[PDB]
Design a protein around this motif. Structure first.
Motif, PDB file in Angstrom:
ATOM      1  N   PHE A  34       1.750   9.054  -5.806  1.00  0.00           N
ATOM      2  CA  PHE A  34       2.704   8.643  -6.865  1.00  0.00           C
ATOM      3  C   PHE A  34       1.943   8.360  -8.148  1.00  0.00           C
ATOM      4  O   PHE A  34       2.138   9.087  -9.134  1.00  0.00           O
ATOM      5  CB  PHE A  34       3.472   7.397  -6.418  1.00  0.00           C
ATOM      6  N   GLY A  35       1.110   7.319  -8.150  1.00  0.00           N
ATOM      7  CA  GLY A  35       0.405   6.928  -9.387  1.00  0.00           C
ATOM      8  C   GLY A  35      -0.365   8.080 -10.000  1.00  0.00           C
ATOM      9  O   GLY A  35      -0.255   8.287 -11.228  1.00  0.00           O
ATOM     10  N   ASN A  36      -1.126   8.814  -9.189  1.00  0.00           N
ATOM     11  CA  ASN A  36      -1.993   9.870  -9.775  1.00  0.00           C
ATOM     12  C   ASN A  36      -1.129  10.932 -10.463  1.00  0.00           C
ATOM     13  O   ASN A  36      -1.508  11.388 -11.557  1.00  0.00           O
ATOM     14  CB  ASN A  36      -2.944  10.423  -8.725  1.00  0.00           C
ATOM     15  N   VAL A  37      -0.014  11.325  -9.848  1.00  0.00           N
ATOM     16  CA  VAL A  37       0.811  12.425 -10.430  1.00  0.00           C
ATOM     17  C   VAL A  37       1.508  11.856 -11.668  1.00  0.00           C
ATOM     18  O   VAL A  37       1.676  12.590 -12.649  1.00  0.00           O
ATOM     19  CB  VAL A  37       1.822  13.035  -9.440  1.00  0.00           C
ATOM     20  N   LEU A  38       1.893  10.588 -11.606  1.00  0.00           N
ATOM     21  CA  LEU A  38       2.488   9.934 -12.788  1.00  0.00           C
ATOM     22  C   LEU A  38       1.498  10.118 -13.937  1.00  0.00           C
ATOM     23  O   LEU A  38       1.919  10.569 -15.007  1.00  0.00           O
ATOM     24  CB  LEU A  38       2.726   8.463 -12.465  1.00  0.00           C
ATOM     25  N   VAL A  39       0.224   9.805 -13.695  1.00  0.00           N
ATOM     26  CA  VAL A  39      -0.817   9.981 -14.753  1.00  0.00           C
ATOM     27  C   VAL A  39      -0.832  11.452 -15.191  1.00  0.00           C
ATOM     28  O   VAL A  39      -0.624  11.698 -16.383  1.00  0.00           O
ATOM     29  CB  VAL A  39      -2.221   9.538 -14.306  1.00  0.00           C
ATOM     30  N   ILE A  40      -1.055  12.383 -14.265  1.00  0.00           N
ATOM     31  CA  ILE A  40      -1.179  13.825 -14.644  1.00  0.00           C
ATOM     32  C   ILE A  40       0.001  14.229 -15.539  1.00  0.00           C
ATOM     33  O   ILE A  40      -0.192  15.084 -16.413  1.00  0.00           O
ATOM     34  CB  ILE A  40      -1.272  14.711 -13.390  1.00  0.00           C
ATOM     35  N   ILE A  41       1.178  13.650 -15.316  1.00  0.00           N
ATOM     36  CA  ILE A  41       2.384  14.042 -16.102  1.00  0.00           C
ATOM     37  C   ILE A  41       2.277  13.364 -17.467  1.00  0.00           C
ATOM     38  O   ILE A  41       2.155  14.072 -18.483  1.00  0.00           O
ATOM     39  CB  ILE A  41       3.664  13.612 -15.367  1.00  0.00           C
ATOM     40  N   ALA A  42       2.341  12.038 -17.472  1.00  0.00           N
ATOM     41  CA  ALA A  42       2.180  11.291 -18.732  1.00  0.00           C
ATOM     42  C   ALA A  42       1.096  11.982 -19.542  1.00  0.00           C
ATOM     43  O   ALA A  42       1.348  12.367 -20.719  1.00  0.00           O
ATOM     44  CB  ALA A  42       1.803   9.865 -18.429  1.00  0.00           C
ATOM     45  N   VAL A  43      -0.081  12.157 -18.930  1.00  0.00           N
ATOM     46  CA  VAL A  43      -1.102  12.739 -19.794  1.00  0.00           C
ATOM     47  C   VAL A  43      -0.661  14.104 -20.304  1.00  0.00           C
ATOM     48  O   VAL A  43      -0.875  14.443 -21.473  1.00  0.00           O
ATOM     49  CB  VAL A  43      -2.454  12.814 -19.061  1.00  0.00           C
ATOM     50  N   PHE A  44      -0.036  14.910 -19.442  1.00  0.00           N
ATOM     51  CA  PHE A  44       0.359  16.253 -19.848  1.00  0.00           C
ATOM     52  C   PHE A  44       1.627  16.261 -20.693  1.00  0.00           C
ATOM     53  O   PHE A  44       1.890  17.246 -21.390  1.00  0.00           O
ATOM     54  CB  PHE A  44       0.544  17.141 -18.619  1.00  0.00           C
ATOM     55  N   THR A  45       2.424  15.194 -20.646  1.00  0.00           N
ATOM     56  CA  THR A  45       3.670  15.159 -21.399  1.00  0.00           C
ATOM     57  C   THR A  45       3.599  14.308 -22.660  1.00  0.00           C
ATOM     58  O   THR A  45       4.535  14.353 -23.465  1.00  0.00           O
ATOM     59  CB  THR A  45       4.807  14.643 -20.510  1.00  0.00           C
ATOM     60  N   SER A  46       2.532  13.541 -22.857  1.00  0.00           N
ATOM     61  CA  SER A  46       2.408  12.659 -24.010  1.00  0.00           C
ATOM     62  C   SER A  46       1.592  13.343 -25.097  1.00  0.00           C
ATOM     63  O   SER A  46       0.437  13.716 -24.870  1.00  0.00           O
ATOM     64  CB  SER A  46       1.758  11.331 -23.617  1.00  0.00           C
ATOM     65  N   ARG A  47       2.197  13.505 -26.276  1.00  0.00           N
ATOM     66  CA  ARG A  47       1.485  14.116 -27.392  1.00  0.00           C
ATOM     67  C   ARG A  47       0.313  13.251 -27.840  1.00  0.00           C
ATOM     68  O   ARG A  47      -0.772  13.766 -28.134  1.00  0.00           O
ATOM     69  CB  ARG A  47       2.446  14.365 -28.555  1.00  0.00           C
ATOM     70  N   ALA A  48       0.513  11.933 -27.898  1.00  0.00           N
ATOM     71  CA  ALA A  48      -0.564  11.039 -28.307  1.00  0.00           C
ATOM     72  C   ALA A  48      -1.732  11.067 -27.333  1.00  0.00           C
ATOM     73  O   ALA A  48      -2.832  10.631 -27.687  1.00  0.00           O
ATOM     74  CB  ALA A  48      -0.039   9.611 -28.450  1.00  0.00           C
ATOM     75  N   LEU A  49      -1.522  11.569 -26.120  1.00  0.00           N
ATOM     76  CA  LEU A  49      -2.576  11.680 -25.124  1.00  0.00           C
ATOM     77  C   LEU A  49      -3.298  13.019 -25.179  1.00  0.00           C
ATOM     78  O   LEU A  49      -4.120  13.300 -24.302  1.00  0.00           O
ATOM     79  CB  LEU A  49      -2.003  11.460 -23.722  1.00  0.00           C
ATOM     80  N   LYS A  50      -3.008  13.852 -26.176  1.00  0.00           N
ATOM     81  CA  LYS A  50      -3.695  15.128 -26.316  1.00  0.00           C
ATOM     82  C   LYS A  50      -5.087  14.928 -26.897  1.00  0.00           C
ATOM     83  O   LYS A  50      -5.353  15.313 -28.040  1.00  0.00           O
ATOM     84  CB  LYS A  50      -2.882  16.086 -27.188  1.00  0.00           C
ATOM     85  N   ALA A  51      -5.978  14.322 -26.118  1.00  0.00           N
ATOM     86  CA  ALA A  51      -7.360  14.134 -26.511  1.00  0.00           C
ATOM     87  C   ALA A  51      -8.283  14.711 -25.446  1.00  0.00           C
ATOM     88  O   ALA A  51      -7.962  14.677 -24.254  1.00  0.00           O
ATOM     89  CB  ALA A  51      -7.687  12.651 -26.723  1.00  0.00           C
ATOM     90  N   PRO A  52      -9.438  15.244 -25.843  1.00  0.00           N
ATOM     91  CA  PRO A  52     -10.324  15.883 -24.858  1.00  0.00           C
ATOM     92  C   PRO A  52     -10.794  14.948 -23.760  1.00  0.00           C
ATOM     93  O   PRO A  52     -11.100  15.418 -22.658  1.00  0.00           O
ATOM     94  CB  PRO A  52     -11.499  16.381 -25.711  1.00  0.00           C
ATOM     95  N   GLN A  53     -10.861  13.640 -24.015  1.00  0.00           N
ATOM     96  CA  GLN A  53     -11.376  12.712 -23.017  1.00  0.00           C
ATOM     97  C   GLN A  53     -10.437  12.535 -21.831  1.00  0.00           C
ATOM     98  O   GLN A  53     -10.899  12.166 -20.746  1.00  0.00           O
ATOM     99  CB  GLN A  53     -11.659  11.347 -23.647  1.00  0.00           C
ATOM    100  N   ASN A  54      -9.139  12.789 -22.006  1.00  0.00           N
ATOM    101  CA  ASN A  54      -8.194  12.604 -20.912  1.00  0.00           C
ATOM    102  C   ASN A  54      -8.275  13.706 -19.866  1.00  0.00           C
ATOM    103  O   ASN A  54      -7.653  13.577 -18.804  1.00  0.00           O
ATOM    104  CB  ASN A  54      -6.774  12.502 -21.464  1.00  0.00           C
ATOM    105  N   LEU A  55      -9.017  14.781 -20.131  1.00  0.00           N
ATOM    106  CA  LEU A  55      -9.252  15.769 -19.087  1.00  0.00           C
ATOM    107  C   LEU A  55     -10.010  15.157 -17.919  1.00  0.00           C
ATOM    108  O   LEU A  55      -9.789  15.540 -16.765  1.00  0.00           O
ATOM    109  CB  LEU A  55     -10.009  16.969 -19.654  1.00  0.00           C
ATOM    110  N   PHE A  56     -10.897  14.199 -18.195  1.00  0.00           N
ATOM    111  CA  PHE A  56     -11.567  13.484 -17.116  1.00  0.00           C
ATOM    112  C   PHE A  56     -10.556  12.752 -16.245  1.00  0.00           C
ATOM    113  O   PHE A  56     -10.634  12.792 -15.012  1.00  0.00           O
ATOM    114  CB  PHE A  56     -12.585  12.502 -17.694  1.00  0.00           C
TER     115      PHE A  56
END
Ligand SMILES: Cc1cccc2c(Nc3ccncc3)cccc12
Length: 266
Positions: free
Chosen positions: A22-44
């Motif tokens: 649950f939590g991990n996929v929530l992250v993968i989505i938020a990160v993939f769905t949040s424009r403000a999260l479009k930073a190279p460091q979030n690939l980690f």
């Protein structure tokens, strides 16, 4: 093995797997769905979440089956690969944490140069290097036990946990020192000091409290002490348990992530 407690154990570990995915996929989505999260460091973070999802989804049942069933029922053709894949997934998660810490440190110090060199190409290169090191350190391997070779076990444990632990400790100690030195309106600043001490001590402490016992006790068995008895299983279970909490530590203390999670929930 237990007859009704097995139900309690299997129930509890299914709970664990659920929370993790649950939590991990929530992250993968938020990160993939949040424009403000479009930073190279979030690939980690994305890679760490994916690795944790893989481990929780596949490795846990075989280890949940083991201990519970009480013996290895799956093909013996699988222990030599199941153990290696488990080691690879866990070491990849640890190395992802260490790489994230190193990136944070290099962003805080030599900020201009590292920002000049914070290309997504470099981010992906680091991700592939982490995965390849994880594969290399897991390339060497009615029942199934983990590897018992003293030299191999000692080397693998050292190079898979002790080095990343030391690197994280050093980087976050340096970051804490920098923040303290820059700490010195005043109530807000002193509130901020308390806040950062916390966010760092939690990050520094969850990982250690979850992995050090197993790896310590693991080497203790390898070196020959082998005092761990049954508690090793508890230390073992603390480690998988650590993965579920891992995304929370690295995402909750960021507003852009908090608001994304709130939007997703609501
Ligand atoms: C050297 C190494 C590194 C990573 C994971 C390993 C492992 N699997 C675990 C261990 C604790 N918690 C969850 C999974 C078993 C044996 C060795 C391992």
């Amino acid at each position: 093995y237990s007859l009704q407690v097995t139900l309690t154990l299997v129930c509890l570990a299914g709970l664990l797997m659920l929370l993790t995915v649950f939590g991990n996929v929530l992250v993968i989505i938020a990160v993939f769905t949040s424009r403000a999260l479009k930073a190279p460091q979030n690939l980690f973070l994305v890679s760490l979440a994916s690795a944790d999802i893989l481990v929780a989804t596949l490795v846990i049942p075989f280890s949940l089956a083991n201990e519970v069933m009480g013996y290895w029922y799956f093909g013996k053709a699988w222990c030599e690969i199941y153990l290696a894949l488990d080691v690879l997934f866990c070491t990849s998660s640890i190395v992802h944490l260490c790489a994230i810490s190193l990136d944070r440190y290099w962003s805080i110090t030599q900020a201009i140069e590292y920002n000049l060199k914070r290309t997504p190409r470099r981010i992906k290169a680091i991700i592939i290097t982490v995965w390849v090191i994880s594969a290399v350190i897991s390339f060497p391997p009615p029942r199934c036990e983990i590897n018992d070779q003293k030299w191999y076990v000692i080397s693998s444990c050292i190079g898979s946990f002790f080095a990343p632990c030391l690197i994280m400790i050093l980087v976050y100690v340096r970051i804490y020192q920098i923040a303290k030195r820059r700490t010195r309106r005043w109530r807000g600043r002193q509130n901020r000091e308390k806040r950062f001490t916390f966010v760092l001590a939690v990050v520094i402490g969850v990982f250690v409290v979850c992995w050090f016992p197993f790896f310590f006790t693991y080497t203790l068995t390898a070196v020959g002490c082998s005092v761990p008895r049954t508690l090793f299983k508890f230390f073992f279970w603390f480690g998988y348990c650590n993965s579920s909490l891992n995304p929370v530590i690295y995402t909750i203390f960021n507003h852009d992530f908090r608001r994304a999670f709130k939007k997703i929930l609501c």
